[PDB]
Amino acid sequence: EFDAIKIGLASPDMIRSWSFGEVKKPETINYRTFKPERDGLFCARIFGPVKDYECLCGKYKRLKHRGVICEKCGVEVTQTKVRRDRMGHIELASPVAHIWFLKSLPSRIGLLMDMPLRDIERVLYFEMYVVTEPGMTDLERGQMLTEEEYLDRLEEWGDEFTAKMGAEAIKDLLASMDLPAEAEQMREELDTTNSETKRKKLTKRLKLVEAFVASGNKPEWMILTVLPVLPPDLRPLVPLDGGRFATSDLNDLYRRVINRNNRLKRLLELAAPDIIVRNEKRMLQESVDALLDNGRRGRAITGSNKRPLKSLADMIKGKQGRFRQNLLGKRVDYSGRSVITVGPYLRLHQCGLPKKMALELFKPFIYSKLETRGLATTIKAAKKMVEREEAVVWDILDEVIREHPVLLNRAPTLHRLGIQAFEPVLIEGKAIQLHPLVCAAYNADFDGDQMAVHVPLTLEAQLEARTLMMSTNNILSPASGDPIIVPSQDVVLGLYYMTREKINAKGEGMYLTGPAEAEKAYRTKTAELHARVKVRITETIKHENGKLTTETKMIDTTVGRAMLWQIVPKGLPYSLVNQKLGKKQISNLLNEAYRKLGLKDTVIFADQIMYTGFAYAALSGVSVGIDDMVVPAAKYTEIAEAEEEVREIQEQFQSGLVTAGERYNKVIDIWASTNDRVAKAMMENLSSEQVINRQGEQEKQESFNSIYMMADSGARGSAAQIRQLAGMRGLMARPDGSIIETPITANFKEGLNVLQYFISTHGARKGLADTALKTANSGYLTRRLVDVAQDVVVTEHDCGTLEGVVMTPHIEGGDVKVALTELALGRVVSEDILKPGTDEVLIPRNTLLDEKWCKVINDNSVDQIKVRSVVTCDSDFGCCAQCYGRDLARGHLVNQGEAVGVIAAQSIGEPGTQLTIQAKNNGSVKLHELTIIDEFGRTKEKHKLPYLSKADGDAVAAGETVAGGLPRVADLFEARKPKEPAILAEHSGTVSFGKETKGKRRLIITRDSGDTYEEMIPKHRQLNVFEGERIERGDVIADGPESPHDILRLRGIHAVTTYIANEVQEVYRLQGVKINDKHIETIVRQMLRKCTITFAGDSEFLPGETVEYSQVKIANRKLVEEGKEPARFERELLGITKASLATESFISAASFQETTRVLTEAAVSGKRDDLRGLKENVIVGRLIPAGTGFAYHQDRQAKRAQ
Amino acid sequence: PGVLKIVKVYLAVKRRIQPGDKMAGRHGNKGVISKINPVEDMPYDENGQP
Amino acid sequence: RTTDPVRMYMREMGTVELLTREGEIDIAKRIEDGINQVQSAIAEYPGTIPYILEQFDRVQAEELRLTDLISGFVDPPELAREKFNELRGKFQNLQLAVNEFGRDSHQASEASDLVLDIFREFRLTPKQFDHLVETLRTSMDRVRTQERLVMKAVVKKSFIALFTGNESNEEWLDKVLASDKPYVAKVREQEEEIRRSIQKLQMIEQETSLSVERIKDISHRMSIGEAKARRAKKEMVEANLRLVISIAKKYTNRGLQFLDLIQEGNIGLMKAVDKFEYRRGYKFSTYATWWIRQAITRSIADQARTIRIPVHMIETINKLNRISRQMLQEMGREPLPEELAERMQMPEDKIRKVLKIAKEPISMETPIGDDEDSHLGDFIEDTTLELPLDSATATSLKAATRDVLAGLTPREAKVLRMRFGIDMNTDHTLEEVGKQFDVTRERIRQIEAKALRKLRHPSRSEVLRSFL
Ligand SMILES: [Mg+2]
Ligand SMILES: [Zn+2]
Ligand SMILES: [Zn+2]
């Protein structure tokens, strides 16, 4: 129907064209008949009939008289809905300036005729005069003339000059302007001037003027003469209950405007004194400003409820505005909500739906089937049977539900696994039964959480739910690729208890033919579940090439592992089960099952793991008791010794040997070592036991305590919680952050006294308050990230570029933090990977790194590899498949046309709630910086080189010495300059000293061309350079934190990309969160969209402005093919907030935030939004250019190419 | 004003405990009932008390 | 320095000082003699006295209201007849001495002055006064248009030389014909426009044939009088703006803002200045107070409610509230609609009707709960909407009716469809169905009867039964 949305200024002719009539009087409805009166705010002639196909006077009161206007009443007989589309207008007695065009800084009326806003507003509130037509006088345009000064001017000239006052004066000043010649005045003035402030103001005003000339808008339209009036149902006046009425504040604002305009017309008729007319015009301006944007021009007008009125702007903007409350998030039909319980009998693709919800949601489908099988003759009969809850309705429901997926959602939806499609199984009760294995994806636990239920209707929606949104297809985390269906809690406890080893158990040493024999033995109460036996295991290995090699050997194991081998699918080793299985071991089982078997085997295996774990956790009888917390006998002795030593240091403070701070920092260490020793003693006592073997000897065994098993299995619990259970609670922090000297020496088993409980509450309250504020901040950060990265879609398969990013293992000292295999898993190479010390092409170009090539790259020991990145992608819009690489949630290469930016934003923002020279390796050493390389090509250690046991190439053996996370992530993503930026060397050259002028220090750099560039340096800076030394570009001048801007300016794109990537990944990795670097790279690519032109070249760009980088690529490519000289640019780094408000489309920018200035700029410049993004297509209600809707848009583009 | 008659009806409903209802102790141990188990299926002691 | 219009209006009001009472009387006499000047000016026009005295002729026969026509008499039909007949007599002297004794004769001027002096002792209705002013205003207008047209045609010094006496004479055109300047060709081409110029105004200028020289100077006295009077009333209104503010003081928080009350008080003040008489010996303050309070109260009644209530019902509501207040004070409880009826001597049913008048509507933005995110506007349902079930039922009913009508004879189906308007753009009586076929009233009536008996049979009605 439509392809774009234009925005511009509304001329009075256009406003009159929109309107169906003129509103003249402020009356709304009659107080007796409750009927619209004539020419009022609800007039039936202007806006349309109140009742469908009727009229006010009742003369034409049926459909036969459509399109016929009554002579008695003037109302066109049509539907009532036309009242939500018909507009009106008010002919203002005097022109009124637009409030947005005047106080949306910068003012576009002040900056179009070169006059300050104080002067302009002095003219609008009718305080001074301004000359329009100087004529043949000494005055010029825009001169202030005070009232008395204007009397003198009238005395000595009189009729020669016109010096008007008010909005009319602004209107005819803008009338007298000639934009072409005035822009040429800019053009000739810019070259002559030298000051930077004047030049910047001049180019701002030139940009505005050129926008006016290009858009076709006239400055005359800047000031309103005809005021449009909104349709009445958009500002309804309706009877709530029993004669009480509900209205909208727009009615009050329009009533004020109409009343004051009528008063102005009456005053003009009566030839009133000038003061009264002037005051009336002032109130007309105030009322129109309050109608358009209340609370901006002055004090907000308040209603009878002592609350400010809501204007047009206040309801097109804000969180509670139209955009974010009704156009991006909508209440929907065919929806339900209920408490969630646990269904341990369900499968991954099944969810338990109550029959009441199924009956209410699937009602039209039930009607359809009842009519098609003829049980109900018509819809009324079908409704009667459905309401009566007849027997056959349930069979019809179980036939409609049979293969119809349903979408389950939980609030908040932090990532895309928060909405999933399931096949419904109909159940009694009122609670939704959820499969346990998906709870971790929902962050859902059954203490009262509720979930929402959505029924897709069209065939395309059902196919999308079954193919993309099924829980079976969603088993890998899109953030990292790790499985998300890993078992937890009861399953892990059961599998751990089943896979444990007990010494001298019943049936030890028996020989078993296989897993079935072991099951038979345990069911017959012959061999205990933890009895060591020898079992004949048949085992199939599925090699990387597809070889299926079967083998059969006798393995020493337990009965439990033999049974668990029954559910393990063929193709996996027995070494994956022949060990005690904690959370990590089961996660590895699922990971390897997915890697070597696929998805179907993995989902069946996950289900069977869940059932086996539940069954054996039930049969185990794990119970927590009061004798399970074994408090060590060494705790009391350690407390006594700590008290004695604290008293010793207490009688040593009076000796003056120590200070108060030293006493504090020594008592803290005394107690913080007593705590560690008590914890270690408790762990040693709790994790071991002494048993009697078959021979009769006393042998040490790992303990079977309930709390120890809970902690060691990884089900739920950790060492710190045990230490607070049976050891010492420890030192605590005061509400200011200080640590109380006397710790809590009692645990929860023996209880605390009053003071200890008070101190504990001091920290509990902080934890809760910080959780709440953390949730708020993480939500805001995720929203900003989505709004910056919403336009990144994989649009091509290959951009045909040669650039890439190098990657090496991450080293932060003498140990590896993360290997190259983890970094490069799933990234397409950029250049051929040569064998170390050889010209052999081990890995060719344009290959995707799976686990097979990861094993290859680990075995052949290569350190640095070049791979493609999203930041280096050359795609004009979005990215290409090869530069992104592997889709983490699918395991294969990224498909064409999926939103990778939204995935990146969700992956980065989801873990926000969780966010708070000795030599050891043999090898050689080298200088780069300092590196220590092992025997192979891997560089094991990396250390900085300050301004020396061994020289370069000297072999070194072991032991030979040479000698607020979330605020940080937000700070990095908004590119905030640090408090004390570290100065960098702008140009390569020799340092030379200048003159220490008053205030601060100066330096100079001498370039290779003889240029002397002056550098401003604060006095407190600890300079790290010496005169006579040639420093390189980007070298550190003063030590300190580095802003991303100067890294981008003086080092490059790759440098800033790496800087942001690892300085966000350090925050994530410190907390234990795994996020792939492609997401941060995508955000960085969106953060580097802008460039400033420096050389005009043969392009039309004027140097000194910001433009999008893709536009410059297109222009430069065209100019190169034409042969004319290209354009030269500088690439700029913008924060995730500025970049979003600087998008080409104004609808997305308006929907994000800062609506007033976005709309003002768009209207003044006359922009066109081509609807080429996710958010604009969501707002307008058409298919998004991503996923299933990608190809469709492509065809439209093809239809727009021809 | 405007109303001629008001009739007020009190309805008493006996709500039984069912899956989905929230049950709790006095130590922060909340929960949602997942199943109403038959008596013969639940654990019992030596004297036979389930 | 300030952004509040109220304080700015206060500043511009404070610049005008409060003049003394002697100054107030001086302004009053300034308006009085300005009115006398404009009154005597419009007298010097040969149609004013006829119109005044044909109005007198109409009112003497009591065809028009006597009180409305005459505002009063100044003392420097008991007495009005005397003055009207005296004006009759000096008009008889005048329109006889106007031409018989010559226009330029000093006796004619003296008789005109006598008539002026006699009429001066009259104060008349403002409506007819305005009529008299604009009657001469239109004449001035078209003669100005003629001279501006001849200016546009010719573009001078010679015209100004004969602008004293020959600006409206044939002699000017004759002498223009006598000119032989190099540009007499262009004014010759403009002579055709002149022939469309000086004929146009020459049917009105002879209506007041003396005033040809004198239209311009009578308009000169017109401008003098109007400017003088408007200056005087401007000064008085600007002086008493402070009284306007003091009066508007006690009407705040009544649904209308302060500045609107001030402006309505300004309207009242201008009305009071228009009809103020200092010869009462009475201060302005009281008369101004009455008029300003009237304007403020009327505007509050007319513009302080979303659903407008007329002034009289507003007074009824105010009296309702006041008497409820008195009865609550007297008897300690809130008055009931029974007891409140007898003290106001107005029926109980109308007391209730006034009580059930809708109050000020509640905004759709009001916070429903303690939270600021829930508003009244989200809890209001669209009741005019049609349910999708009803639309499906309507479509099914149309289909079933079509299927049933398919089981009848073509003529019978046609008569049923035409007399109940199905699948057509209108409904029809049996006359139209009779005319469309070759068939009469009773025939069509009984074909419809036969159709309804056919469809009342149970065999072809089970489907339609489910639609009820
Ligand atoms: Mg919960
Ligand atoms: Zn009508
Ligand atoms: Zn690419």
Neighbours of C, requiring at least 3 CB pairs below 8 Å, are A, B
- Three-state DSSP state, A40: coil
Please report residues of B whose CB lies closer than 8 A to that of A339: 20, 22, 32
CA distance C299 to C266: 12
Instruction: Kindly list the distances between the CA atom of residue C427 and the CA atoms of A101, A359, C412, C448, in Å, as whole numbers in the listed order.
Output: 57, 42, 16, 15
- By Cβ distance, the residue of A243, A342, A448 closest to B34 is A342
Task: Compute, in angstroms, the gap from residue A51 CA to the centroid of ligand 2.
Answer: 12
Give DSSP secondary structure letters for A501-556. Answer: --SS-TTTT-EESSHHHHHHHHHTTSS-TT-EEEEEEEEEEE-TT--EEEEEEEEE
Give ∠ CA C19-C22-C27 in degrees, rounded to 5: 75
Q: Which of A660, A641, A640, A635 is nearest to A650 (CA)?
A: A660
Answer whether C266 touches A (CB < 8 Å): yes
Amino acid making up residue A1177 = N
Long-range contacts of C299-303 (CB under 8 A, 24+ apart): C299/C256, C299/C260, C299/C261, C299/C264, C300/C251, C300/C254, C300/C255, C300/C256, C300/C261, C303/A26, C303/A255, C303/A259, C303/C256, C303/C260
CA distance A457 to A455: 6
* Cβ atoms within 10 Å, residue A47: 28
Q: Which of A1034, A1048, A1043 is nearest to A871 (CA)?
A: A1048
Task: Compute, in angstroms, the gap from residue C391 CA to the centroid of ligand 2.
Answer: 27
Which strand (E) or helix (H) includes residue A410?
Answer: none
What single DSSP character describes residue A65? G
Which strand (E) or helix (H) includes residue C401?
Answer: helix C388-405
CA distance C365 to A608: 55
Expressed in angstroms, the distance from the first to the final Cα of chain C is 74
Which residues fall within 8 angstroms of residue A1054, CB to CB, at 6 or more apart?
Answer: A805, A871, A872
Q: Which residues of C46-76 are buried (b: 16+ CB within 10 A; e: fewer)?
A: eebbeebeebbeebbeeeeeeeebbeeeeee
Please report residues of A whose CB lies closer than 8 A to that of B19: 341, 429-431
Please report residues of B whose CB lies closer than 8 A to that of C348: none
CA distance C135 to C215: 12
Residue whose tokens read 């003129």:
A22
Min distance C217 CA to chain A CA atoms (Å)? 24
What is the three-state SS of A580-639? Answer: CCCHHHHHHHHHHHHHHHCCHHHHHHHHHHHHHHHHHHHHHCCCCCCCCCCCCCHHHHHH
Give DSSP secondary structure letters for A229-267. Answer: E--GGGS--EE-STT-EEE-HHHHHHHHHHHHHHHHHHH
β-bridge mates for residue A865, sequence order: A807
Answer whether C308 touches A (CB < 8 Å): yes
- Three-state DSSP state, C71: strand
State the resolution, in angstroms. Answer: 3.1
Q: Is A859 exposed, middle or buried (0-12, 13-18, 19+ CB in 10 A)?
A: exposed
Which residues fall within 8 angstroms of residue A445, CB to CB, at 6 or more apart?
Answer: A439
Expressed in angstroms, the distance from the first to the final Cα of chain B is 62
Please report residues of A whose CB lies closer than 8 A to that of B3: 242
Residue whose tokens read 């002498």:
C175
Q: Is C450 exposed, middle or buried (0-12, 13-18, 19+ CB in 10 A)?
A: middle
CA distance C106 to B2: 83
Closest chain A CA to residue C306:
A28
Ramachandran region, residue A361 (left: φ > 0; alpha: ψ -120 to 50; beta: rest): alpha
CA distance A692 to A730: 37
Amino acid making up residue C329 = Q
What single DSSP character describes residue C458? G
Min distance A242 CA to chain B CA atoms (Å)? 6
CA distance C329 to C326: 5
Amino acid making up residue A273 = P
Answer whether C355 touches B (CB < 8 Å): yes
The separation between CA C363 and the C-alpha centre of its own chain, rounded to angstroms, equals: 33
**Is the CB of residue A1126 less than 8 Å from the CB of residue A1175?**
no
Instruction: Kindly list the distances between the CA atom of residue A1150 and the CA atoms of A1089, A1140, C381, in Å, as whole numbers in the listed order.
Output: 19, 10, 29
CA distance A190 to A198: 9
Min distance A15 CA to chain B CA atoms (Å)? 43
Q: Which of C442, C27, C64 is nearest to C234 (CA)?
A: C27
Amino acid making up residue A932 = I
Judged by CB atoms within 8 Å, which residues 307-336 of A form the interface with C?
A: 307, 310, 320
* Cβ atoms within 10 Å, residue A1182: 16
Which residues fall within 8 angstroms of residue A765, CB to CB, at 6 or more apart?
Answer: none
CA distance B18 to B32: 10
Q: Which of A891, A888, A883 is nearest to A866 (CA)?
A: A883
Compute the CA torsion angle C417, C418, C419, C424 (nearest 10 deg). 90
Which residues fall within 8 angstroms of residue A930, CB to CB, at 6 or more apart?
Answer: A917, A942, A943, A944, A945, A962
Q: Which residues of A1057-1076 are buried (b: 16+ CB within 10 A; e: fewer)?
A: bbbbbbbbbebbeeeebbbb
Torsion over CA: C126, C129, C131, C134 (sign): negative
Residue whose tokens read 């009022």:
A40
Residue whose tokens read 């429901």:
A397
Which residues fall within 8 angstroms of residue A768, CB to CB, at 6 or more apart?
Answer: none
List the strands of the sheet with A144-145, edge to edge: A144-145, A129-133, A162-164
CA distance C149 to C355: 66
The bridge status of strand B22-24 relative to strand A1168-1169 is: unpaired
The bridge status of strand A432-434 relative to strand A335-342 is: parallel
Task: Compute, in angstroms, the gap from residue A445 CA to the centroid of ligand 1.
Answer: 5
Q: Starting from the CA of residue A797, give the closest ligand.
A: 3
The bridge status of strand A19-22 relative to strand A989-993 is: unpaired
Ramachandran region, residue C421 (left: φ > 0; alpha: ψ -120 to 50; beta: rest): left
CA distance C1 to C10: 14
Q: Starting from the CA of residue A439, give the closest ligand.
A: 1
Min distance B22 CA to chain C CA atoms (Å)? 26
What is the three-state SS of A805-832? Answer: EEECCEECCCCEEECHHHHHCCCCECCC
β-bridge mates for residue A1015, sequence order: A1003
CA distance A1029 to A1152: 50
CA distance A393 to A370: 8
Task: Compute, in angstroms, the gap from residue A62 CA to the centroid of ligand 2.
Answer: 11
Give ∠ CA C435-C441-C444 in degrees, rounded to 5: 85
Q: How was this structure determined?
A: cryo-EM
C330 is written with which tokens?
């007297």
Ramachandran region, residue B48 (left: φ > 0; alpha: ψ -120 to 50; beta: rest): left
Q: Which of A635, A626, A633, A624 is nearest to A727 (CA)?
A: A635
Q: Starting from the CA of residue A57, give the closest ligand.
A: 2
Amino acid making up residue A1105 = E
Amino acid making up residue C33 = D
